Amino acid sequence: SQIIRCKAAVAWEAGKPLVIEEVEVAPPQKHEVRIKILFTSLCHTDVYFWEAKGQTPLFPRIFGHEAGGIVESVGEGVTDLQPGDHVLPIFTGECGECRHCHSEESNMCDLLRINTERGGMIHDGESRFSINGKPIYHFLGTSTFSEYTVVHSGQVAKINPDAPLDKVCIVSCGLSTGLGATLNVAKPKKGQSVAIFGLGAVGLGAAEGARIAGASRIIGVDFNSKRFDQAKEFGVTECVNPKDHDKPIQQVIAEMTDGGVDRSVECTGSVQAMIQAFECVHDGWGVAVLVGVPSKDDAFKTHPMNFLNERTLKGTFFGNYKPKTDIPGVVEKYMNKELELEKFITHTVPFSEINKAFDYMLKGESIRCIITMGA
Amino acid sequence: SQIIRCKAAVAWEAGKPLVIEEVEVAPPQKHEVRIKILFTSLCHTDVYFWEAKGQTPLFPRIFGHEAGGIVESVGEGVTDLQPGDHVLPIFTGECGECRHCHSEESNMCDLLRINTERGGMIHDGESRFSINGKPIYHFLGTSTFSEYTVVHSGQVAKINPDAPLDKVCIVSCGLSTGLGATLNVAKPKKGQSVAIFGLGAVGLGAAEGARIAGASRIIGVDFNSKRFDQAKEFGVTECVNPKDHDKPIQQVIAEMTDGGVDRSVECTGSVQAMIQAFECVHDGWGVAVLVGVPSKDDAFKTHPMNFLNERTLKGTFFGNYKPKTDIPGVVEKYMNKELELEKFITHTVPFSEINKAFDYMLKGESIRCIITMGA
Ligand SMILES: [Zn+2]
Ligand SMILES: [Zn+2]
Numbered sequence A, B: 001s002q003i004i005r006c007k008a009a010v011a012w013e014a015g016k017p018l019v020i021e022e023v024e025v026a027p028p029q030k031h032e033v034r035i036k037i038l039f040t041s042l043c044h045t046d047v048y049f050w051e052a053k054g055q056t057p058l059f060p061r062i063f064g065h066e067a068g069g070i071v072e073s074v075g076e077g078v079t080d081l082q083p084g085d086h087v088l089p090i091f092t093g094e095c096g097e098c099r100h101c102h103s104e105e106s107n108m109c110d111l112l113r114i115n116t117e118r119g120g121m122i123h124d125g126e127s128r129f130s131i132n133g134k135p136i137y138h139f140l141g142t143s144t145f146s147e148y149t150v151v152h153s154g155q156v157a158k159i160n161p162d163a164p165l166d167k168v169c170i171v172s173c174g175l176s177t178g179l180g181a182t183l184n185v186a187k188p189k190k191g192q193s194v195a196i197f198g199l200g201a202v203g204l205g206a207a208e209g210a211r212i213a214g215a216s217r218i219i220g221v222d223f224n225s226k227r228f229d230q231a232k233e234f235g236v237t238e239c240v241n242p243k244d245h246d247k248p249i250q251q252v253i254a255e256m257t258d259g260g261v262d263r264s265v266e267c268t269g270s271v272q273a274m275i276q277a278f279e280c281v282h283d284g285w286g287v288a289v290l291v292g293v294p295s296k297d298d299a300f301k302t303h304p305m306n307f308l309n310e311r312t313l314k315g316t317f318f319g320n321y322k323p324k325t326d327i328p329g330v331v332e333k334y335m336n337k338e339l340e341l342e343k344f345i346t347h348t349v350p351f352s353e354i355n356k357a358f359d360y361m362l363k364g365e366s367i368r369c370i371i372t373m374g375a
């Protein structure tokens, strides 16, 4: 295996438009695979680090972690993947042999769990991307905004080769995070009520999960009212904008539902929203689930009696899905027509116009925009 | 049915010794039962309201809610109890026909749930106790520090008539609160580790529950080191006094257990302890359970990532036991030799020396002191 010269969308500077560059992609080392990306999409997380909003900024960098592609080659020690396999790169991995992977409960692999600071590969700490002999840094070990990328095999989910990669690429992050938050963690029973804070891809995945679970009432909470109408296609039965009410939103929800919803799922990462999501569930049997990741360090706060009145608060990561074990199953759920993905896709652009996907997201116009390589 | 003249231990004034008085006990009204108390014990909750520490103080008052006795008569509409039945009064009830009672998850009856302010009966708002025509107020609808008391039937658990009332009287509050907090809510699997904050009756019930569940490691946390040795009889494998460590106790526990315990149970009601109990459980699969009731209004606070790292926080009330449905079953657990109650009993006094039970508790010398009527 040798070096590949291809196109990648490089971020040279925070908040500036990506530039299509010719980059060089080194061959995969031990336990790595090199993937030809066919379709990729944009997630709020790409945007957050591209703006360098909070974290330690790292540039130049190739973003992107939602994608579908085909294995071009594998490094030594790789046995579960071969050239030609259809795959989804995942931003967090499953080594399959650590304490967390062995557990039935957790998907937080000690080897391969999400790391937003890391710009190089595990094996040697180096980037496989370069331009004129200078490193272009990785993002989440996936960097899918490139015609070719290199990814640790534990972060590569082999899927059904008949599944259309331009649809199921969105399964690798946002949608599955919400879907699993509901189906694996909240676990609403048939007939129950659910409140969902946030109506982006995670929230709409959570709603979709509640619909699949047979929830009879699904209340969407978002500050942008223009997200409301489309939300009904995902099973949301009514939407509430906290701005239209003087009362705290948890009180509004509790009055709507004679004491509160049976389940809630907080998908925005706002701490105030976490607090509201917890307090809006019913006493006795209410269960709140946090999945949105916060940008601030503000503490979760609440009066202890809210708990002693028999509420439960659960946090989850990536919907408690195991990347390699479970995600292929999620693709099947779509193949077998339980899961409806098409409605998540509101836009499509060629790789050459990738910056448009940023525009659509920053304007709140899109759910997911599919970016198509080779055009 | 007519009026009974008997002895009761009356509190006339906050923090002052109880006085044995001759009181009059009116006959039971609709859905009420009148009980001859044979054995009763003291709980920290009696003491807290007797000192009038926080709540709205109400005097004169007859305290006591842990007891075993025999039904003397029943009011109209009572069908599940008859004179001669062996019973345990419970501080919180089960009407059996409200939304909370119908639920599989909750024991927070809409009709009969704990009320610490109420000095009279539900039916008419009046007390059945009097001295010289003046009311002596009820406590938790049980008031068991009297040779005879009147209690709503929903708060009266008929139990096995062969069970010794001078042992199983402690089953009606503290012990069962802890036992159930562990067995019904924490639900530790065989081999797991458990941290228990507080080594009073609730904590020792929680420990006993963890032992019964087959926990391999049970770590007791209490500020009073003299509670440690006796705790081993309850299954505690080691004890830790936060005062002997510079590090925060949740860090100490996490270092003892390679990341934290599998389960924790907070039994003191200290808010700081609730925070520590939550943070000391392991990421991925850790579950913390709050059951101790706070005396202050301080908020529970913690960094949200502690949740998103896949921790779970559960609050419970009375160990999630249904008073009438489950508590008789707990007595059987003792009859069938699964549950060991004798070790909870460290003292015994006659009703005439009831104030001694207060002394033993205030000196931290006792777990439970049995008070015996008729002497
Ligand atoms: Zn692993
Ligand atoms: Zn994402």
Ligand SMILES: [Zn+2]
Pocket (backbone or CB within 6 Å): B094, B095, B096, B097, B098, B099, B100, B101, B108, B109, B110, B111, B112
């Ligand atoms: Zn009820």
Ligand SMILES: [Zn+2]
Pocket (backbone or CB within 6 Å): B043, B044, B045, B046, B065, B173, B174
């Ligand atoms: Zn008590």
